[PDB]
Amino acid sequence: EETCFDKYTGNTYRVGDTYERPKDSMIWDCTCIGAGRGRISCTIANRCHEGGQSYKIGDTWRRPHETGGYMLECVCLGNGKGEWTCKPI
């Protein structure tokens, strides 16, 4: 059967199956390409993470303030860069 194996995760994938693979202190979105011995194709994911947990594009993680004593509220904007915006109260 057409399946690709990623030694990083340890689970095989059928053709057209995408998964998550941690590459160099990062999370990669990988897909399995058929034909041959199951070629593995991996490309970075269009998301924003770091700090403590992962964050999606346009997502929010309104949590306390790192440099303040009040609940901080921040957002994440993609646009192929990885920017964020917060407005504490």
From Swiss-Prot:
Disulphide bond pairs: C4-C32, C30-C42, C48-C76, C74-C86
Tissue: Expressed in the inner limiting membrane and around blood vessels in the retina (at protein level). Plasma FN (soluble dimeric form) is secreted by hepatocytes. Cellular FN (dimeric or cross-linked multimeric forms), made by fibroblasts, epithelial and other cell types, is deposited as fibrils in the extracellular matrix. Ugl-Y1, Ugl-Y2 and Ugl-Y3 are found in urine.
Subcellular location: Secreted, Extracellular space, Extracellular matrix; Secreted
Region (Required for binding to LILRB4): 30-49
Annotated ranges, domain Fibronectin type-I: 2-45, 46-89
PTM text: Sulfated. Forms covalent cross-links mediated by a transglutaminase, such as F13A or TGM2, between a glutamine and the epsilon-amino group of a lysine residue, forming homopolymers and heteropolymers (e.g. fibrinogen-fibronectin, collagen-fibronectin heteropolymers).
Disease involvement: Glomerulopathy with fibronectin deposits 2: Genetically heterogeneous autosomal dominant disorder characterized clinically by proteinuria, microscopic hematuria, and hypertension that leads to end-stage renal failure in the second to fifth decade of life. Spondylometaphyseal dysplasia, corner fracture type: An autosomal dominant form of spondylometaphyseal dysplasia, a group of short stature disorders distinguished by abnormalities in the vertebrae and the metaphyses of the tubular bones. SMDCF is characterized by flake-like, triangular, or curvilinear ossification centers at the edges of irregular metaphyses that simulate fractures. These corner fractures involve the distal tibia, the ulnar aspect of the distal radius, the proximal humerus, and the proximal femur.
UniProt function note: Fibronectins bind cell surfaces and various compounds including collagen, fibrin, heparin, DNA, and actin. Fibronectins are involved in cell adhesion, cell motility, opsonization, wound healing, and maintenance of cell shape. Involved in osteoblast compaction through the fibronectin fibrillogenesis cell-mediated matrix assembly process, essential for osteoblast mineralization. Participates in the regulation of type I collagen deposition by osteoblasts. Acts as a ligand for the LILRB4 receptor, inhibiting FCGR1A/CD64-mediated monocyte activation. Secreted by contracting muscle, induces liver autophagy, a degradative pathway for nutrient mobilization and damage removal, and systemic insulin sensitization via hepatic ITGA5:ITGB1 integrin receptor signaling.
Subunit structure: Mostly heterodimers or multimers of alternatively spliced variants, connected by 2 disulfide bonds near the carboxyl ends; to a lesser extent homodimers. Interacts with FBLN1, AMBP, TNR, LGALS3BP and COL13A1. Interacts with FBLN7. Interacts with COMP. Interacts (via type III repeats 9-14) with TNFAIP6 (via CUB domain); this interaction enhances fibronectin fibril assembly. TNFAIP6 may act as a bridging molecule between FN1 and THBS1. Interacts with TNR; the interaction inhibits cell adhesion and neurite outgrowth. Interacts with FST3 and MYOC. Interacts with SVEP1. (Microbial infection) Interacts with S.aureus FnbA.
Protein name: Fibronectin
Organism expressing this protein natively: Homo sapiens
